[PDB]
Amino acid sequence: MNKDLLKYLSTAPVLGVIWIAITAAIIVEFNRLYPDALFFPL
Amino acid sequence: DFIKPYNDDPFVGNLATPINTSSLTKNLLGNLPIYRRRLSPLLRGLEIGMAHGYFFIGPFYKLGPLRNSEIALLSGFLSCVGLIIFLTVGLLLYGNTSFDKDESKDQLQTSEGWNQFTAGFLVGAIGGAGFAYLILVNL
Amino acid sequence: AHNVKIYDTCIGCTQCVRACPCDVLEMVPWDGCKALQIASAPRTEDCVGCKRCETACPTDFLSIRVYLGAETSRSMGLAY
Amino acid sequence: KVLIDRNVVPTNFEKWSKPGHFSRSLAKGPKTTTWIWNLHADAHDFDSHTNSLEEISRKIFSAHFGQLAVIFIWLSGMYFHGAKFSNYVAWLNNPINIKPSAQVVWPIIGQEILNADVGGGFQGIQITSGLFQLWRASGITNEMQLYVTAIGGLFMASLMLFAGWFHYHKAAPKLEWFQNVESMLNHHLAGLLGLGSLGWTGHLIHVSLPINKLLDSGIVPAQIPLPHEFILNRNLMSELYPSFNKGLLPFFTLNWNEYNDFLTFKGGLNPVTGGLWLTDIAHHHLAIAVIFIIAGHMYRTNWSIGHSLKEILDAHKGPFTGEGHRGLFEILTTSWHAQLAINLAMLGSLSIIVAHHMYAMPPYPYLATDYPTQLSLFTHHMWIGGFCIVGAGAHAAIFMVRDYSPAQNYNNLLDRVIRHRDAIISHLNWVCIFLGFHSFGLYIHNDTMRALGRPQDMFSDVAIQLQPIFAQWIQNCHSIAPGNTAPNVLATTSYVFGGDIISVGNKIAIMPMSLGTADFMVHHIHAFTIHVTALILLKGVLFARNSRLIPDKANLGFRFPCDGPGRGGTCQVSGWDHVFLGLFWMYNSLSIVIFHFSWKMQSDVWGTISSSGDISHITRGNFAQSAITINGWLRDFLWAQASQVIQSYGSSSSAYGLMFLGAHFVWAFSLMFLFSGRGYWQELIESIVWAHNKLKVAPSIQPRALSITQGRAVGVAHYLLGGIATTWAFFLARIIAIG
Amino acid sequence: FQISEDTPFDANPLVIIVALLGWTLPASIPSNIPILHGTGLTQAFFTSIQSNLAEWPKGPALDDPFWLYMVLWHVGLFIVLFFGTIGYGISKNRV
Amino acid sequence: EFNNLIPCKESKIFNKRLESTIKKLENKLSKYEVGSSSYLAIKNTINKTNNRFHKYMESGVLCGKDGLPHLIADGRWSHAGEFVIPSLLFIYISGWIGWVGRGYLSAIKNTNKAIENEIIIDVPLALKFMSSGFIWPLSALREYTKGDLLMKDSEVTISPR
Amino acid sequence: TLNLKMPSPSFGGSTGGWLRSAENEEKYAITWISKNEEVFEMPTAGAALMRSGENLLYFARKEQCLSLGTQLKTQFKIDNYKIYRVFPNGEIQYLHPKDGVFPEKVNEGRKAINTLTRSIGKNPDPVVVKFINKQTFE
Ligand code: CLA
Ligand code: CLA
Ligand code: CLA
Ligand SMILES: CC1=C(/C=C/C(C)=C/C=C/C(C)=C/C=C/C=C(C)/C=C/C=C(C)/C=C/C2=C(C)CCCC2(C)C)C(C)(C)CCC1
Ligand code: SF4
Ligand code: SF4
Ligand code: SF4
């Protein structure tokens, strides 16, 4: 893959957005599949 | 063309325009009591007082809190006198602080001159208010 | 008038003098630095206290310092 | 002449990983976090990147294609949401009893509550953009037509994106091409506006007219022929509009009166839909098309005929104005900022005209009795107008700092304006004080008199009256004009001026708006707020280059925080700082305009009618007696109408409750920036940096407090966002409940 | 008369006379619209003046055609006066 | 203790909340046709609501007189899931983020691209640090005892006093 | 000496010029020599026409004169300008360039005013000058 493009994908805002979006997705998907966890079940 | 430097001096902060330097403007201002030639400060004050006192009664008479009463006009007159006294004290305070021993050649721009003008304004103004009352109380 | 002082860390770069819009400052001969000159403030009666001189000064901390003081018509920058 | 340079700029990603390549100052890279903010702030300040007017012009032209691409994607999205996620077809069948919706939320963390019961078996967010009414007027009757329009939008977006790339990287026009202002005007008048209007007339006559006539007669949408049927089978048209039997012969022989069935001059409103007659709209566009195509033959291009813009300008000089318009042609063909200033002022002013004209002469079917849409469209277009006007001030000031020269402006109108700036600003200062006292002062008088138990001493319709007699007289002229000064018009331009109460369903579409003391008072508030906004912006422009305080201000530039604490203190002297302050006053001004609109319409216009004919207004005519005190606005407007937004939790309007609070938060947060200064913040950051250095976790890009100017920018941006979004939430929650 | 500091101005009252005749004549061409009756704007205005002076103290009502006549008539008079002054100014080499 | 509280399964207010919530949803459900997308959406909300209330009932979370779950965060282990266990989870994750971020910062300072690698991340280098976070507590503890965690007070800049 | 009869640039006038305080407190004069007629910007706003030869302008503030001076130097390469303070009583002080040479250029004869033989960090604490007329920066 093109090195200049890869360098662009490594810039702070691009990595910032991608990483936050993945994190946000993980939280969304946990809450979509295991909803309403007010506490750890034990 | 019509707009020119003021007093033929382009670096003074003013312009000569129709509003400030036309013949009509110069004729009007020159003959107003404050500027008019060969007037004493007392007479300047007297004429100014009369003109102002006369018109002061209208707002108080027609729009004051007693406008709808039988004594509307008298309330109007007392309100003027009240206003006139405050304005006179203003004039006293202005003269007291603004003039000292400097006997300028204008006359009016002096302690004594300004005191004559203030005397005029007071008597003129109560007079003019008085005269307006007499017209209105009849008509 | 404002007080302007020049301290002995001056490197005689002239930038404060060039920055000053009221001609308060000038360069005078000196032995203390490689440039063989120091800034001077002989006309502080004309100082408006804008602090452009301090902005221009490269040394750390500053070599020129403006202490705002008693106001006059000159210092307040009045054209009326 | 077409003048171009080919293969100018290579296409690769090399510079994408070199932030701030475009600027000499930024290309060296950061030493400090200030650099990160500067990168964004300076990205589109093209004339700060280069001195070449040719280079600047090329970037602008290409950026414009970029903007058009974005607008096509947005437009395409609206159509696609119409096609895929809306109750458009259901609404088409029953527009009085179905709320439009074209946004549906996914069921996550309980947010599906926001899918409201809008009717037609549908659940979704109720929209207020007026798209459904637009699409109905266009003759769209099914989701297939929306899908295809959406796809066409994506095609156009891609075409704009190609043109942007092409005209920057591959075939960039020369400066001489851009300075062809005579040719540009001819093409934009005759071509863009003229042919645009003619083309739309074509759609109106051949598609909108028949379909809407059938819809309004009560034919079911699915039973109406498709648009092309009316084109191919003329008899379908001639059934509806008999003059189509005569074809195009009346046109070429100037027997234009033959077409008076589909080209009308009715005025008023369609009684079925409560919108303007489409036959009037068709005639409007035909007339406009003719005028524009003629207008676009004014200027000289490649032949002997036409005017030189320069020659026109140079001739207009009189005894009061020195060299007159001499030198303006050079300004307006060498300064993009000067062009932007004019064009923002006019575009903004136009948006405001659109707001007023669309509520009073509702052009779309079922717009007038969709109260949420009426309120939304007026408010939206007022805001867009305000922001553009403040922008005009910004770009007028930037011109004065960067592009003005004395040699170009010797004793012309521009020179003569700046030579009496003290006379202009002093008088505007006075008129603002006068207006402030004799407008807002009347409300304070009234509050005081009513609190003191003296209603007879108030300025009101039932005490000391201030009747807007001139506005009342104009209303009367407009009401009697049909068949008089407008002899061939059948009805008023607007029922707002007088005449009938138009109703659709049992909802009032439009009716006469009485003007009394409360209307007089609020009009002088508008005069006041607009004059002050003008004062601030005008002052910024006229004193951008210098003042008695700062004789060399232009050298400091457009955007600088101050010139130090001397001369008494010089914070906020720059042109930029006048825009900053002007934004708050524009915000203040337009807030009162939209509040006036909201309350007046609910009190005196909108509502229900019985069969007997008894009008019941939303707030029952309380405007006349309540809108003449500040307490009345606080109580009968803000407190009373906030009931909807404030009681919205646990319902489909709960999003508005949340946005209302969220917007109050952003507003208050703005004050941290506006009321403080960076000296405090830079010192605080020093202690925090100490802790990071101690733990060997300090960044090499050193943390700095925001610049003085950025602090101000952040402050006003949060103030506006918070303030405007609060009103948005307030308005929508209210009007969706009661309207 | 000087329009400014040391600037003599003509102020020829023929301009006013020519303007008044220049407007009043064509404005007296008759019309067919109901508000102007079968007369022109000049006649309509002059008639409304008479009819309103017949009720000396009582001023014209809002809805009286007088107001429309007055404004329309003055708009036309003022346009001719305006261009007339500029025209005379061109002839006198004000520019 | 906690006499002002009661288990949510024993709470009449908590049960009434379920009843009233469902009753509202079933009224909303009656406006739509059986089988329609709208109908199925409302049914999913009804099921999700029932699941939530039953889950809390079976948990042994305490309810106030408002009939809402109240959490105990004093340290007692019978309520560990309400705060202590979430807390340990948070500390483990947040400490990881901090530790790997601190490690990356230090790595790039020992290069010529100390500033460039802050705005344009060296992604391989970053992923190496991110991958190494799972034993940050021990790493951090050893670094502390080695005297590598902290700078001396005399090696950090300070202002006049 | 100044020379009050020296001619001025051509200018139609503005409202930005001097007011009463110039007449009865002090005003400033700037003179210069230009090779050719040329348009320049007034620091009080507006375009004015520089005469070829001698030019005299009056301003309310010293900063206005110096601002014009800087414009003359930068834009027109005129470095022969002189600035004077003019009192109502008729007295005239020459101000700039004070000794013939611009202040930015070192010149023997000048003496250091307001210099201190220490760095800024060696000033005494405010408490030490409490109840005496000294300043910490003296
Ligand atoms: C700011 C606008 C405003 C206006 C227009 C009014 C008007 C009024 N007030 Mg209200 N009032 C106001 C604000 C205002 N008020 C505010 C902010 C408060 C504080 C809460 C009040 C509290 C108040 C009280 C407690 C009372 C009033 C009362 C009144 C009435 C009588 C006042 C009077 O006699 O003045 C005297 C006026 C003058 C001496 C002169 C006015 C200015 C002149 C006309 C200007 C002329 C300029 C001229 C055109 C220049 C031409 C020059 C050239 C041609 C020569 C009047 C209706 C009284 C009342 O009874 O109400 C019915 C009363 O009791 N007011
Ligand atoms: C704090 C004390 C105070 C008092 C006792 C008053 C009293 C009054 N005010 Mg109010 N007023 C005040 C503060 C006060 N004011 C302030 C701070 C404001 C600004 C918000 C106002 C604004 C205001 C307005 C706008 C109006 C009043 C009016 C009135 C009068 C209404 C009752 C009436 O019907 O008389 C009718 C009035 C008369 C019969 C005339 C009485 C005039 C007296 C005799 C003049 C005396 C002047 C004094 C002795 C001069 C020397 C003082 C100083 C130079 C040493 C009453 C005299 C109304 C009024 O009528 O004023 C003329 C009115 O319109 N007031
Ligand atoms: C690896 C990054 C890192 C680490 C280990 C720390 C550590 C610390 N910060 Mg700092 N901080 C950081 C980044 C970091 N910070 C950033 C980016 C900012 C700008 C927002 C700050 C702003 C900040 C302030 C204002 C304060 C601290 C304080 C502190 C101390 C107490 C905990 C705290 O309050 O955090 C609070 C910090 C935040 C809420 C900011 C968000 C942290 C982000 C999410 C971390 C960024 C991670 C980075 C992008 C990962 C890339 C790694 C990858 C390339 C491998 C602690 C020494 C406090 C202190 O001095 O106590 C003594 C304090 O008042 N920090
Ligand atoms: C409307 C108009 C105008 C204006 C006007 C005016 C501004 C007026 C004013 C006026 C006035 C404002 C007047 C006044 C008067 C006054 C008088 C008439 C007085 C009198 C007095 C007397 C008779 C007496 C006195 C006395 C007495 C009683 C006793 C003791 C004291 C004395 C001696 C002082 C003009 C022209 C622009 C234009 C046209 C229209
Ligand atoms: S503060 Fe301003 S005026 Fe004073 S010496 Fe410094 S630069 Fe000159
Ligand atoms: S700027 Fe600072 S270092 Fe340079 S000459 Fe002035 S005081 Fe000395
Ligand atoms: S307070 Fe801030 S903006 Fe004002 S003079 Fe000082 S540094 Fe400049």
Virtual CA dihedral for G98, G104, G107, G112, nearest 10 degrees? 80
The preferred substitution site among B131, B133, B134, B136 for testing ligand 4, maximizing ligand atoms within 8 Å of CB, is B131
Technique used: cryo-EM
What 3-state class would DSSP assign to B135? helix
Residues of chain G with C-beta less than 8 angstroms from the C-beta of D322: 12
- Exposed/middle/buried for A4, CB within 10 Å: 0-12, 13-18, 19+? middle
What 3-state class would DSSP assign to D32? strand
Q: Is C47 annotated in some ligand binding site?
A: yes
User: Is the CB of D108 less than 8 angstroms away from the CB of A31?
Assistant: yes
**Looking at beta carbons, which pairs linking D59-68 to residues 24 or more positions away fall under 8 Å?**
D59/D168, D60/D336, D61/D167, D61/D168, D61/D173, D61/D178, D62/D164, D62/D165, D62/D167, D62/D168, D62/D172, D63/D164, D64/D164, D65/D160, D65/D161, D65/D163, D65/D164, D65/D167, D66/D160, D66/D161, D66/D164, D68/D160
What 3-state class would DSSP assign to C29? strand
Look up residue D585 and give its two tokens: 């006053």
Distance in angstroms (rounded) separating the CA atoms of residues B53 and F123: 87
Q: How many contacts does A have with F, using Cβ atoms within 8 A?
A: 42
Question: Burial letters for D494-512: b for 16+ Cβ neighbours within 10 Å, e otherwise?
Answer: bbbbbbeebbbeebbbbbb
Distance in angstroms (rounded) separating the CA atoms of residues D397 and D323: 23
User: Is the CB of F102 less than 8 angstroms away from the CB of D696?
Assistant: yes
Distance in angstroms (rounded) separating the CA atoms of residues B54 and B130: 8
How far CA D256 is from CA of D210, D253, D283, D482, D483, in Å, comes to 20, 8, 12, 22, 21
Residues of chain D with C-beta less than 8 angstroms from the C-beta of A2: 13
Q: Is D524 annotated in some ligand binding site?
A: yes
Q: Which of E94, D417, D381, E71 is nearest to G46 (CA)?
A: D417
Protein residue closest via CA to atom 3 of ligand 7? D571
Looking up tokens 């003569």 gives D416
Q: Which of D637, D630, D609 is nearest to D506 (CA)?
A: D609
Rg of chain G taking only CA atoms, in angstroms: 20
User: Is the CB of F115 less than 8 angstroms away from the CB of D700?
Assistant: yes
What 3-state class would DSSP assign to D680? helix
Q: Please tell me the number of the ligand nearest to residue C59's CA.
A: 6
Q: Chain D residue with minimal CA distance to A2?
A: D13
Backbone torsions φ then ψ of E64, nearest 5 degrees = -65, 130
Distance in angstroms (rounded) separating the CA atoms of residues D6 and D167: 9
Distance from CA of A42 to the nearest CA of D (A): 22
Backbone torsions φ then ψ of B17, nearest 5 degrees = -125, 170
Q: How many contacts does D have with E, using Cβ atoms within 8 A?
A: 22
User: Is the CB of F109 less than 8 angstroms away from the CB of D29?
Assistant: no
D424, containing H or E segment: helix D421-451
Do residues G26 and G86 touch, judged by C-beta distance below 8 A?
yes
Which atom from ligand 1 is nearest to the alpha carbon of D448? Answer: 20
Question: Burial letters for E2-37: b for 16+ Cβ neighbours within 10 Å, e otherwise?
Answer: ebbbebebeeeeebeebbeebbbeebeeeeeeebbe
User: Is the CB of D415 less than 8 angstroms away from the CB of G40?
Assistant: no
Nearest CB to C76 within list D551, D563, D567: D567
Interface contact B6, partner G, CB < 8 A: yes
Do residues D135 and D82 touch, judged by C-beta distance below 8 A?
yes
Largest CA distance in chain D: 92
Interface contact D143, partner C, CB < 8 A: no
The preferred substitution site among D560, D571, D675 for testing ligand 7, maximizing ligand atoms within 8 Å of CB, is D571
**Looking at beta carbons, which pairs linking B111-114 to residues 24 or more positions away fall under 8 Å?**
B113/B41, B114/B41
In D207-324, beta strands by DSSP E: none
What 3-state class would DSSP assign to D502? strand
Looking up tokens 């699915």 gives D222
Residue G27 C-alpha to ligand 5 middle, in angstroms?
20
Q: Which of G60, G66, G68, G38 is nearest to G51 (CA)?
A: G38
Distance in angstroms (rounded) separating the CA atoms of residues C46 and C44: 5
SS3 content of chain C, % helix, strand, coil (to 5): 15, 20, 65
* Residues of B (102-121) whose Cβ lies below 8 Å from G: none
Do residues F99 and F139 touch, judged by C-beta distance below 8 A?
yes
Q: Which of D393, D327, D382 is nearest to D359 (CA)?
A: D382
Give the sign of the dihedral formed by CA D156, CA D158, CA D161, CA D166: negative
Q: Please tell me the number of the ligand nearest to residue C61's CA.
A: 6
Distance from CA of D457 to the nearest CA of B (A): 8
Q: Please tell me the number of the ligand nearest to residue F99's CA.
A: 3
Distance from CA of A15 to the nearest CA of D (A): 13
Distance in angstroms (rounded) separating the CA atoms of residues D290 and D189: 11
Cβ count within 10 A of residue D557: 15
Instruction: Tell me if the bond preceding G97 is cis, omega within 30° of 0.
Output: yes
On the CB side of D150, CA atoms within 13 Å amount to 13
On the CB side of A10, CA atoms within 13 Å amount to 22
Look up residue G9 and give its two tokens: 């640039």
- Sequence-ordered list of residues with C-beta below 8 angstroms from that of G128, at least 6 positions apart, any chain: G136
Beta bridge partners, D164, equal: none
Interface contact D10, partner A, CB < 8 A: no
**Helical axes D371-402 vs D575-604, angle rounded to 10°:** 160
Residue B79 C-alpha to ligand 2 middle, in angstroms?
8
Distance in angstroms (rounded) separating the CA atoms of residues D689 and D695: 10
Distance from CA of E94 to the nearest CA of D (A): 6
Q: Which of D42, D88, D44, D38 is nearest to D66 (CA)?
A: D44
Do residues A36 and F53 touch, judged by C-beta distance below 8 A?
no
D126, containing H or E segment: strand D122-126
User: Is the CB of E3 less than 8 angstroms away from the CB of B22?
Assistant: yes
Distance in angstroms (rounded) separating the CA atoms of residues A25 and A34: 14
Q: Which alpha helices (H) appear in chain F, and where do they start and end? A: 12-29, 37-57, 84-109, 116-119, 123-131, 136-146
Which atom from ligand 2 is nearest to the alpha carbon of B79? Answer: 40
* Residues of B (20-59) whose Cβ lies below 8 Å from E: 21-24
Distance in angstroms (rounded) separating the CA atoms of residues G58 and G42: 11
D337, containing H or E segment: helix D336-360
Do residues F65 and F8 touch, judged by C-beta distance below 8 A?
no
Look up residue D434 and give its two tokens: 């006068």
Look up residue D589 and give its two tokens: 């001004």
Backbone torsions φ then ψ of D126, nearest 5 degrees = -75, 125
Q: Which of B37, B34, B24, B5 is nearest to B117 (CA)?
A: B34
Q: Which of D398, D387, D397, D393 is nearest to D348 (CA)?
A: D387
Do residues D552 and C61 touch, judged by C-beta distance below 8 A?
no
Find the residues whose C-beta lies inside 6 A of ligand 4.
Answer: B 50-51, 54-55, 123-124, 127-128, 130-131
The preferred substitution site among F102, F118, F132 for testing ligand 3, maximizing ligand atoms within 8 Å of CB, is F102
Rg of chain C taking only CA atoms, in angstroms: 13
DSSP 8-state secondary structure symbol assigned to residue D629: S
Backbone torsions φ then ψ of F157, nearest 5 degrees = -75, 145
Q: Chain D residue with minimal CA distance to A5?
A: D13
Residue D572 C-alpha to ligand 7 middle, in angstroms?
8
Distance in angstroms (rounded) separating the CA atoms of residues D494 and D360: 6
Q: Which alpha helices (H) appear in D543-653, and where do they start and end? A: 553-556, 575-604, 623-626, 630-632, 640-641, 643-646
Distance in angstroms (rounded) separating the CA atoms of residues B4 and A25: 73
Distance in angstroms (rounded) separating the CA atoms of residues D524 and D471: 13
Rg of chain F taking only CA atoms, in angstroms: 27
Distance in angstroms (rounded) separating the CA atoms of residues F55 and F61: 10
- Angle CA D308–D314–D318, to nearest 5: 145
User: Is the CB of B24 less than 8 angstroms away from the CB of E94?
Assistant: no
**Position G82: which residue type?**
K
- Exposed/middle/buried for D681, CB within 10 Å: 0-12, 13-18, 19+? middle
Distance in angstroms (rounded) separating the CA atoms of residues D535 and G130: 49
Q: Which of D220, D375, D330 is nearest to D737 (CA)?
A: D375
Question: Burial letters for F111-128: b for 16+ Cβ neighbours within 10 Å, e otherwise?
Answer: eeeebbbbbbbbeeebee
Interface contact B3, partner G, CB < 8 A: yes
Phi and psi based region of residue D633 (left: phi greater than 0; alpha: psi -120 to 50; beta: remaining): alpha
Protein residue closest via CA to atom 4 of ligand 6? C13
Looking up tokens 């008129």 gives D431
- Angle CA E30–E32–E36, to nearest 5: 70
Look up residue D661 and give its two tokens: 């609070």
User: Is the CB of D108 less than 8 angstroms away from the CB of A8?
Assistant: no
Residues of chain F with C-beta less than 8 angstroms from the C-beta of A20: none
Distance in angstroms (rounded) separating the CA atoms of residues B44 and D324: 45
Q: Is C33 annotated in some ligand binding site?
A: no
Do residues B118 and B95 touch, judged by C-beta distance below 8 A?
yes
Residues of chain B with C-beta less than 8 angstroms from the C-beta of E4: 2-4, 16-18, 21-22
Residues of chain G with C-beta less than 8 angstroms from the C-beta of C80: 19-21, 60
User: Is the CB of C50 less than 8 angstroms away from the CB of D566?
Assistant: yes
Q: Which of C2, C47, C50 to mutate to test the interface with D (most CBs of D within 10 A)?
A: C50
Distance from CA of F76 to the nearest CA of D (A): 30
Do residues D424 and D432 touch, judged by C-beta distance below 8 A?
no
User: Is the CB of C42 less than 8 angstroms away from the CB of G107?
Assistant: no
Q: Which of D685, D683, D686, D690 is nearest to F150 (CA)?
A: D690
Do residues C69 and C3 touch, judged by C-beta distance below 8 A?
yes
User: Is the CB of G111 less than 8 angstroms away from the CB of C40?
Assistant: yes
Residues of chain E with C-beta less than 8 angstroms from the C-beta of D486: none
Q: Which of D259, D509, D570, D238 is nearest to D364 (CA)?
A: D509
Instruction: Tell me if the bond preceding D558 is cis, omega within 30° of 0.
Output: no
- Angle CA B65–B67–B70, to nearest 5: 120
Distance in angstroms (rounded) separating the CA atoms of residues G138 and G122: 11
- Angle CA A16–A20–A25, to nearest 5: 150
CB B119 less than 6 A from any atom of ligand 2: no
Largest CA distance in chain F: 77
Looking up tokens 């999700």 gives F48
- Sequence-ordered list of residues with C-beta below 8 angstroms from that of D564, at least 6 positions apart, any chain: C49, C50, C51, C52, D570
D102, containing H or E segment: strand D101-103
Do residues G111 and C28 touch, judged by C-beta distance below 8 A?
yes
Give the sign of the dihedral formed by CA D345, CA D346, CA D347, CA D352: positive
Do residues G131 and C21 touch, judged by C-beta distance below 8 A?
no
How far CA B138 is from CA of B73, B132, B133, in Å, comes to 11, 10, 8
Q: Which of F45, F49, F55, F84 to mutate to test the interface with A (most CBs of A within 10 A)?
A: F55
